[PDB]
Amino acid sequence: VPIIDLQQDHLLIVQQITKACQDFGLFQVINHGVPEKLMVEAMEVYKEFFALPAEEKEKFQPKGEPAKFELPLEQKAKLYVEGERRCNEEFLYWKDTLAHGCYPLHEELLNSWPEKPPTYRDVIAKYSVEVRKLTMRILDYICEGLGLKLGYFDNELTQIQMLLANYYPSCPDPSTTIGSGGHYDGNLITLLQQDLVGLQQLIVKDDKWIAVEPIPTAFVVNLGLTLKVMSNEKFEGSIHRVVTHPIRNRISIGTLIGPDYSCTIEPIKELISQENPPLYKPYPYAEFAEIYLSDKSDYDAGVKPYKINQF
Ligand SMILES: O=C(O)CCC(=O)C(=O)O
Ligand code: NA
Ligand code: NI
Ligand SMILES: [Sr+2]
Ligand SMILES: [Sr+2]
């Protein structure tokens, strides 16, 4: 798993990011310019949030129950559950996610965010601005690696910025060791902050799941299915999963950037050529999203209906 220092020479960064995108669809970045103090404060906010009493968490349960990952995927803050498991043949546990949009930060959106812990809005608004800035920088390195003009993705293709704070209860003897099953992210690009082992990447060419080392001040970058399609498979998407920790409750902070639901997705036209014919026909992001969220029969079930020029 490449670890890319963003204070190296510009051209080296472009070259290393491009190779990682071609080879794996996942890499880590260090010396990335986001304040370490802000990364630590954001993790502390989520530790404090997930430790709040059940009565506080009811504020994020629409109509009194957790949300599910199904359309419409709203931007107002909600608690989501998934993946029920049995621990020690005794207690049930699940994967909890607090998720909300971040951009644009409309007053109506901000007022859906937690107000306890009391530093939530200040810390997480600052965090979201910094992580978006880093994401857009990485997308520009990707533009240069693909041969596209800088700023290609600075439009409706990055209109949605979802923050997903995941909480994985520990279990030493779980019904299943996987707390989050293997998936591609459906969006364009994701930045993930972690501080505890559990994230693994599927090396498809080697049919092997390998650890993504936790570096608490780094960001893990993983390319989503939308970028796999837009790059016409010149870049890989990342298939990744999370293993429940035996001892510690694990928290990760994901920033998932991607298109609006009114967007049409297709391979970037300027890169298509006679020897690089399009491998997907254009499709509505919202129709893709419905399939992506519903059909788990294959990792790329969401885009299978749109594949073309298959040989
Ligand atoms: O918890 C993690 O490290 C991964 C989270 C993830 O893959 C997701 O939310 O899409
Ligand atoms: Na625990
Ligand atoms: Ni993911
Ligand atoms: Sr409830
Ligand atoms: Sr092998």
DSSP of 243-286: EPPSSS-EEEEEEEEE--TT-EE---GGG-BTTB--SB--EEHH
Alpha-carbon span 167 to 194, nearest angstrom: 11
Alpha-carbon span 108 to 76, nearest angstrom: 8
Alpha-carbon span 109 to 47, nearest angstrom: 22
Which residues line ligand 1 at a C-beta cut-off of 6 Å?
Answer: 164, 166, 180, 185, 192, 194, 199, 240, 242, 252, 254
Under 8 Å between Cβ of 77 and 98: yes
Residues with Cβ < 8 Å from 185, sequence gap 6 or more?
222, 223, 224, 225, 237, 238, 256
Q: Name the residue type at position 226.
A: T
Declared resolution, Å: 1.3
Residues with Cβ < 8 Å from 116, sequence gap 6 or more?
49, 52, 56
199 CA closest ligand 1 atom index: 3
- The rounded Å distance from CA 249 to ligand 2 centre is 5
The answer to whether 167 is annotated as binding is no
The answer to whether 250 is annotated as binding is yes
Under 8 Å between Cβ of 198 and 250: yes
Residues with Cβ < 8 Å from 287, sequence gap 6 or more?
none
**Residues with C-beta atoms within 5 A of ion ligand 2:** 170, 249
- The rounded Å distance from CA 166 to ligand 2 centre is 14
Q: Which of 23, 19, 17 is nearest to 5 (CA)?
A: 17
Alpha-carbon span 6 to 69, nearest angstrom: 34
H helix runs in 147-176, sequence order: none
Under 8 Å between Cβ of 232 and 306: no
- The rounded Å distance from CA 244 to ligand 1 centre is 12
- Beta-bridged to residue 100, according to DSSP, are 163
The answer to whether 252 is annotated as binding is yes
* Three-state DSSP class for residue 115: coil
Q: Peptide bond preceding 117: is omega within 30 degrees of 0, i.e. cis?
A: yes
Alpha-carbon span 173 to 140, nearest angstrom: 44
Diameter of the chain measured on Cα atoms: 60
Under 8 Å between Cβ of 134 and 32: yes
Residues with Cβ < 8 Å from 82, sequence gap 6 or more?
68, 69, 94, 95, 97
Residues with Cβ < 8 Å from 278, sequence gap 6 or more?
232, 266, 267, 272, 308, 309
Indicate the domain borders of the chain.
1-311
Under 8 Å between Cβ of 115 and 121: yes
Q: How far is CA 7 from the centre of its chain?
A: 24
Q: Are strands 3-5 and 26-30 parallel, antiparallel or unpaired?
A: parallel
Work out the number of other CB atoms within 10 angstroms of the CB of residue 56: 14
Strand (E) or helix (H) holding 80 = strand 78-87
Q: Which of 129, 135, 128, 190 is nearest to 6 (CA)?
A: 135
Alpha-carbon span 83 to 66, nearest angstrom: 13
- The rounded Å distance from CA 275 to ligand 3 centre is 32
Q: Name the residue type at position 190.
A: T
In the chain, count H helices and then E strands.
7, 14
Closest ligand, as measured to the CA of 245: 2
* Three-state DSSP class for residue 121: helix
Burial of 67 per CB tally in 10 Å (0-12, 13-18, 19+): buried
Alpha-carbon span 137 to 112, nearest angstrom: 28
Work out the number of other CB atoms within 10 angstroms of the CB of residue 97: 22
Residues with Cβ < 8 Å from 120, sequence gap 6 or more?
45, 49, 113, 114
Alpha-carbon span 247 to 277, nearest angstrom: 49
The answer to whether 166 is annotated as binding is yes
Query: Can you spell out the DSSP letters for 230-244?
Result: HTTTSSPPPEEEEEP
H helix runs in 51-119, sequence order: 54-57, 107-110
Under 8 Å between Cβ of 309 and 279: yes
Under 8 Å between Cβ of 254 and 192: yes
